[PDB]
Amino acid sequence: EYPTVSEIPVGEVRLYQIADGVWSHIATQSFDGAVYPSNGLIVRDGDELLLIDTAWGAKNTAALLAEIEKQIGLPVTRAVSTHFHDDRVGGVDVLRAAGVATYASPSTRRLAEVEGNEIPTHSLEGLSSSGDAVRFGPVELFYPGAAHSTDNLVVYVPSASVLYGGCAIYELSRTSAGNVADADLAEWPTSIERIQQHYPEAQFVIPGHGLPGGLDLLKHTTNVVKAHTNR
């Protein structure tokens, strides 16, 4: 069973093995009196690990590194943040201090700077146009176009057919739009269509928040986004 927000105290991180050499990491944060879960990804890269996204804050990300060391015991050598919000870059400074090379698109780095958030060190080239993909270690990085944010990336693990949608993809239990202050609602369905066209064989789809599923999560997200558009 996938861990639930009720099963994780803030400050703690859980790892969930999705496939051989692929885990998600699950952490929580409190906001306006409620508690929210957040997902990232860990992908084995030979004798090293690639991290996708922080665990939403410095304290959570330190706990993430400690949990990885305890449960997996391979070094996190690189980390990619998939958009500029704090559940993706919050903790970049902890990663950097630990010797992890941190990466994001130049779009994400710019938006993080404007927002006053932590800024990944390295800039990922080749992701500037909708439909662009690049290989990064054991994963493919894909820019589907603007959606949840103008910079959002998705991540595919070809060995395991795992699609990590980040916060551009909603879990099935989310029936109404979440944080859309930085979204391109008009482009979001089209961007989702690009994901479906590029990764039709995906067997596991991980949203930025909540429970994984299959490719149904893409149409689900389009339905919620379009309903919000028409509010």
Ligand SMILES: C[C@H](CS)C(=O)N[C@H](Cc1coc2ccccc12)B(O)O
């Ligand atoms: C942090 C994350 C970036 S995508 C996010 O905004 N999550 C939404 C809840 C939320 C809105 O504004 C916040 C501010 C702080 C914490 C949580 C939130 B949601 O899942 O409904």
Ligand SMILES: [Zn+2]
């Ligand atoms: Zn976000």
Ligand SMILES: [Zn+2]
């Ligand atoms: Zn998010």
